[PDB]
Structure formats: structure tokens, C-alpha cells
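Aim 2 progress. For DNA Gyrase inhibitory protein, the working sequence is reproduced below.
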Amino acid sequence: MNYEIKQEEKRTVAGFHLVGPWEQTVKKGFEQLMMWVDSKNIVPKEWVAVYYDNPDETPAEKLRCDTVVTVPGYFTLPENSEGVILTEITGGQYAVAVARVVGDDFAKPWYQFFNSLLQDSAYEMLPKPCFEVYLNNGAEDGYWDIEMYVAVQPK
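Predicted C-alpha cells for this construct:
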């Protein structure tokens, strides 16, 4: 599928870090995230899932992912925010792709993106976590539009 390279600034993110199979942790993490966001009246810039491992190579028990919201760099963590991490997603060049998910196959767009990026004659993927921004609320629209980011550098 299609994509283009963009120069991104770093992102300050707040939320939860989870270890284990994504079939359970991703959903779990976002549930905790929504409860926290609502309780603190936080206004997120983005709802994001960050992936640190390849699920076809790293054992499921060791998989890591973050379910967080992108906030301003000057964000002050609200009082009584136990268990919440506050860290950064680095800036740099990222290949960016947009896709629509109808159903529960959220892995499909990622596979399509990686296969297409592997054929790029000008850029190569870097050993950095990849992430996706959930553009809309699919729990209400019936479909999820996602924006995938994969770190790259010139070949």
C-alpha cells in the first residue's frame, strides 16, 4: 500500500505499559487509559499504540506495548495518577500510511505496510518502535481509521 516519508518531532506520551500477548494487553491497556483520561479531564492530541517487538519472532510472554495518549511537551501529570507512565516517542523520519479497518483484522494493514516498505529503493527501516494513531472512535462509527508510523532512514 501507499505511504510517504515525514519528518516528525518527538512525542510526549502518557499512559500504560503492558507486557504479554497483545490479544489481551492492548484492549486492557486502552480501557485503563480511557478511565484515567476521563477521570483527569485530559484532552489528548492522539490515541496511540506503540509496539516494541515483532510478534512473529518474540515469544508472546515477552511482548511489550504502550497504550497512551499524546500530550503537549509541557504536560504536567495530574495528581493521583498511579501506574501511569510518562515518556517519549522519538522524532525523526517516519514512513506514514493510512488505512481503514472494517472488522477485527488490525494486523492486516501492518503486514501490508511492512511488505510495501520493504520494497523501497530509497529508505530502510530502523530498529525503533513503530506506532499507530487511532484517528476516530470505531466503537461508535463501526470502522477504525488508523495512521501507522514506521521509523526509517535513507539507504
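The longest strand covers residues 144-154. This observation will guide construct design in the next reporting period.
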